[PDB]
Swiss-Prot record:
It holds the Pfam family Lys. The gene is LYZ. This is Lysozyme C. The keyword Signal applies. It catalyses: Hydrolysis of (1->4)-beta-linkages between N-acetylmuramic acid and N-acetyl-D-glucosamine residues in a peptidoglycan and between N-acetyl-D-glucosamine residues in chitodextrins. The lineage of its organism: Eukaryota, Metazoa, Chordata, Craniata, Vertebrata. One of its GO terms (molecular function) is lysozyme activity. It comes from Gallus gallus (Chicken). In the egg white and polymorphonuclear leukocytes.
Amino acid sequence: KVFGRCELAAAMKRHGLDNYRGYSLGNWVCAAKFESNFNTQATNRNTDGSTDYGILQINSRWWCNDGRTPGSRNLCNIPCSALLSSDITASVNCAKKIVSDGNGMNAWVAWRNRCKGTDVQAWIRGCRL
Ligand SMILES: [Cl-]
Ligand SMILES: [Cl-]
Ligand SMILES: [Cl-]
Ligand SMILES: [Cl-]
Ligand SMILES: [Cl-]
Ligand SMILES: [Cl-]
Ligand SMILES: [Cl-]
Ligand code: NA
């Protein structure tokens, strides 16, 4: 599914991501924009052989099982395929675990490089929330 901007902001708020660990909804929308372009079916293979999955490009080294990332963990206790669903529940629940890990949203390199310290409230401007 390719979400609209305000459609995704609303879905993330419905699942309790707004201000989760102190991160406003515009931070999450911005991270999803640059990670996936709001496409739940986004995938990216890393040099190390891990794969990033879904709207927030969650990685197989720690967070989900794909059966093809040697030595990896599955801390969200999900198949990585669950992160590609039209329903963002699995992505949101796993994102809450990642952002609680100690480095906040710096876990998402694209958030640190493209969203951090920007006017992220622009990402929810105009949305009926
Ligand atoms: Cl957009
Ligand atoms: Cl915001
Ligand atoms: Cl594996
Ligand atoms: Cl595990
Ligand atoms: Cl599995
Ligand atoms: Cl949803
Ligand atoms: Cl933090
Ligand atoms: Na894994």
